[PDB]
Design a protein around this ligand. Sequence first.
Ligand SMILES: Nc1ncnc2c1ncn2[C@@H]1O[C@H](COP(=O)(O)OP(=O)(O)NP(=O)(O)O)[C@@H](O)[C@H]1O
Length: 352
Amino acid sequence: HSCIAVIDAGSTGSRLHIYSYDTDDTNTPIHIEEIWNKKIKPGFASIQPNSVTIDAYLTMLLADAPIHNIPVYFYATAGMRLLPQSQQKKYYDELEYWFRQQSQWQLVEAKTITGNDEALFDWLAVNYKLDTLKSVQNKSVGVMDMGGASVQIVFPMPKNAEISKHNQVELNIYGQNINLYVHSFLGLGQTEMSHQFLNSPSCFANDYPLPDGESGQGNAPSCKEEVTSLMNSVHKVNQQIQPLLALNPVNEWYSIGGISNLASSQLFHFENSELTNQSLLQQGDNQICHQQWDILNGQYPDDEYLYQYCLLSSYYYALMVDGYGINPNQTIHYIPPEQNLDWTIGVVLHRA
Ligand SMILES: Nc1ncnc2c1ncn2[C@@H]1O[C@H](COP(=O)(O)OP(=O)(O)NP(=O)(O)O)[C@@H](O)[C@H]1O
């Protein structure tokens, strides 16, 4: 067995993953098993970028690991992407120095991966879990990550000279050439985007107390329309994605991230670990947007995201339907939250 470590340096914290694997006769990892993990808070991009702080942080993350002499990839995501490159450099200068002072961890790369890179890993992670990678599919699989700070979309598409090279990836896995379109929208993740909508009455249950002192008066179509403006006028989601998706239809959609949590909640009713956007918007509109808040809160006092469900159902619909151009009646699978799907397994597949 070979071993590799991957650190996901995300927004709320950093998670170290240690994987064992074998390699098959296509030079591709198989039997990938996570043998150890560790999560620390807060996010790397939120700590003071000096030697003492970074030493304390990396020591806390790595110290108890049951290994000696393992390759490690340190990959930061949207949290670091939101920082100026001059500020990011401070972190990486300290990190590079820290790894050089020790011998147990063999640093391969430490960097902020692009949203496009993250999309690739998302697609690999989901397809590995579904066991759709080892043999030729003739069945187009697309993946959407509803992340906290960025959202990713990724689907098969033949190499196209007219499209940015950064939105296209080429790789060979289990002996097969794959060509994927990848795209990420930074800031459109549900935590970041929500900061624009907190005083929008259409996005909250009736009588929900908004920060500015006004009251929720929810209406999913109205909240969706608001969100759609941000998506298409600022992020240009529809303009970029919809034509390409039209020309390269996906046969099956899988989603990961927040949507899987919302869909698995006690409030929403979905079966078969799947949903349609039509049903999502209807349920959000009826059960939250037009629902009296105080009564609702009394009934679901333990769901900390409950108050956001009018906004989030509206937002997911805006993204998939008005943004990506997915039919409202199209089935969207979601990976159950309890399966702990993690994009870092894609790093093993692509880089180990
Ligand atoms: N019940 C829920 N409904 C909707 N979203 C949720 C729910 N619970 C958690 N989420 C969010 O879904 C997004 C993506 O999930 P996840 O990537 O697993 O978050 P995390 O790893 O816990 N946080 P982060 O460091 O930002 O990646 C995050 O913004 C979570 O806050």
